[PDB]
Amino acid sequence: LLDSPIKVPLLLSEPINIIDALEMRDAVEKPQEFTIVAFVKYDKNQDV
Amino acid sequence: AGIAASITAKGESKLEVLNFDFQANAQLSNPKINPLALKESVKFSSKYLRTEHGSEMLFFGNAIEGKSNTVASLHTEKNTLELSNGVIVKINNQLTLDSNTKYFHKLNIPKLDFSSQADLRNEIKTLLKAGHIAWTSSGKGSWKWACPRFSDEGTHESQISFTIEGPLTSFGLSNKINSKHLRVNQNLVYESGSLNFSKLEIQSQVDSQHVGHSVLTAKGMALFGEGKAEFTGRHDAHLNGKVIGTLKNSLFFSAQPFEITASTNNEGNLKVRFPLRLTGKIDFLNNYALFLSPSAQQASWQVSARFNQYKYNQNFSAGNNENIMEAHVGINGEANL
Numbered sequence: 001l002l003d004s005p006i007k008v009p010l011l012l013s014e015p016i017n018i019i020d021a022l023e024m025r026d027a028v029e030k031p032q033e034f035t036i037v038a039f040v041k042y043d044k045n046q047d048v
Numbered sequence: 049a050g051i052a053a054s055i056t057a058k059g060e061s062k063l064e065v066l067n068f069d070f071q072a073n074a075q076l077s078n079p080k081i082n083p084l085a086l087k088e089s090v091k092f093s094s095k096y097l098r099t100e101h102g103s104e105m106l107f108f109g110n111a112i113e114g115k116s117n118t119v120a121s122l123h124t125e126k127n128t129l130e131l132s133n134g135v136i137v138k139i140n141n142q143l144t145l146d147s148n149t150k151y152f153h154k155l156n157i158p159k160l161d162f163s164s165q166a167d168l169r170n171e172i173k174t175l176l177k178a179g180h181i182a183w184t185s186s187g188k189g190s191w192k193w194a195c196p197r198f199s200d201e202g203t204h205e206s207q208i209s210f211t212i213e214g215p216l217t218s219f220g221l222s223n224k225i226n227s228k229h230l231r232v233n234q235n236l237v238y239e240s241g242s243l244n245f246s247k248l249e250i251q252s253q254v255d256s257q258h259v260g261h262s263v264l265t266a267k268g269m270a271l272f273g274e275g276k277a278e279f280t281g282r283h284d285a286h287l288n289g290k291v292i293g294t295l296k297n298s299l300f301f302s303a304q305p306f307e308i309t310a311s312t313n314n315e316g317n318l319k320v321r322f323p324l325r326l327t328g329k330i331d332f333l334n335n336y337a338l339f340l341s342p343s344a345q346q347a348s349w350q351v352s353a354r355f356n357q358y359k360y361n362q363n364f365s366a367g368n369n370e371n372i373m374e375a376h377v378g379i380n381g382e383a384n385l
Contacts, residue, residue: 010094011065021062 002032049078069093083108097122112139127155143176164193181212202227215242231255246270248279260288266299277303293318293330312336329356344369357384 003026005018019026026032053074060067071091078084084107091100099120106113114137122129130152137145151168168189175182187206193199202225209220216239223234235251248268255261268279281299293316300311318330333352339345346367353360363378 007061007066008059008068010068011096014063014066016063018062018066 065096260286308340310338
């Protein structure tokens with residue numbers, strides 16, 4: 001259920017499934033991988 | 049004081065159409081003596097669609113210059129669409145603008161042997177000044193396509209001439225269009241100087257193989273203060289095809305101080321080819337003549353309407369004179385049974 005395609009719809013209709021383009025044979029027991037990494041920083045000169 | 053804002057967003061997957069390549073940049077500059085410069089450029093690239101924009105505004109006090117272009121282009125197997133716009137605006141003492149717009153497409157659907165193409169240039173040049181207007185544009189475009197249900201080709205040419213200076217208005221319209229089946233020229237001219245006169249002139253010439261020809265010409269000269277009106281109204285229509293005949297309309301008059309005369313003349317000889325080889329014989333004489341004076345007047349109206357085998361003449365004529373009063377009614381009509 002968690003292996004469904006994820007995309008932003010510029011074109012809503014998919015001529016080929018993203019999984020099909022990925023060529024996987026995903027099963028229920030296959031651990032799908034997701035990792036989000038975000039960094040944010042605001043810089044103030046210590047030279048006052 | 050300046051700010052640099054740059055963006056690079058890249059969302060990637062398969063199905064390249066689904067892959068976009070976005071970039072946006074913004075740069076601002078502002079010294080204490082206030083000449084301001086601003087610039088922008090935004091880019092996205094996905095196989096399905098690509099549109100590009102760049103705008104750079106400058107402000108040197110009284111002087112302001114605006115440049116901004118945007119061009120989009122669609123690319124698919126059946127068709128490739130192309131739209132481009134460039135805008136140049138500058139304001140120092142007058143407000144003059146130009147905005148050019150090129151459109152293009154080339155659509156081809158070989159499933160039914162269909163090909164369509166149209167290139168349109170839509171450009172505006174405009175100048176604004178206190179006491180003067182200079183506006184004009186050219187609606188230039190052409191077309192072509194061959195489809196079993198529909199096939200056409202021709203060129204369209206429209207020019208719009210407008211201008212203002214002092215208390216006189218100048219406006220010139222002239223449309224010239226050509227097509228395989230329809231050919232027509234439409235010139236229109238108008239001018240009126242303050243509260244002095246009014247010049248109206250019409251030039252319509254329509255060309256049609258199936259219908260025949262039709263000519264409309266008419267001209268107007270009105271002078272104010274003295275209350276004179278003198279417009280010339282004429283027209284000739286040749287009818288060909290299912291309806292064959294001639295329609296002529298002469299419209300004459302002269303409105304003058306204490307004198308007004310109207311001459312209307314509508315004539316038509318029409319033979320309409322109905323289904324089952326039945327012809328309607330329409331022949332009518334509608335003729336009018338009027339005169340008006342403070343002391344005497346007259347009105348005459350005469351109709352001679354005839355359909356197929358039924359003919360009808362209706363006669364009426366009234367004349368006001370101190371010597372004699374005219375009052376007669378002439379009614380005559382025959383209907384074969």
